[PDB]
Design a binder for this molecule. Sequence first.
Ligand code: JGP
Length: 185
Amino acid sequence: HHHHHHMVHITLDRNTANSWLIISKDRRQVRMGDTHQNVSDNKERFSNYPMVLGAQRFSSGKMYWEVDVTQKEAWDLGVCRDSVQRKGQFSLSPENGFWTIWLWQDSYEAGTSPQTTLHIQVPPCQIGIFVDYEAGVVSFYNITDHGSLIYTFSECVFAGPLRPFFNVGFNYSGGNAAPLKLCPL
Ligand SMILES: O=C(c1ccc2c(c1)OCO2)N1CCCCCC1
């Protein structure tokens, strides 16, 4: 692709984080801790899942950023509405305000309803995310495989400001402790 010139500097918003996440001092990395990270509860925090939002809000233009997923067994990435549900159980779908892909149990899926199988020959270590607000497009790229297309959501109905969206996943296995990292420009 040729989206790199719309690069934006994303930082994580600690106030949205599940109370078990550890966000680095530079707000560019997040991982699972061993326990409750000693923060107060608030209505922004994702309660059921190890999710966090970027601080930036987007309502126009073209935006691009990259995320490192090296050695993780499970994660979700993409964008979501600023007004998504934070508490209780929910599915990642456009109907619920999410435009995401994920890894789970050695398969990659797009968060459509129902979910769509992705065809990835080279397991990605870094994912590029492109948003075109006006066109209603969210696209995912495999940076490990020369930027090859993973998935495009088109005809998106954003219906509000968008925030970068992250899920570090469960670590029931002991094999998914590695962080998500926002890669330098
Ligand atoms: O992966 C998780 C986990 C993370 C966030 C959660 C959660 C579970 O439920 C609500 O938000 N853990 C922690 C507890 C069990 C042992 C390790 C796995």
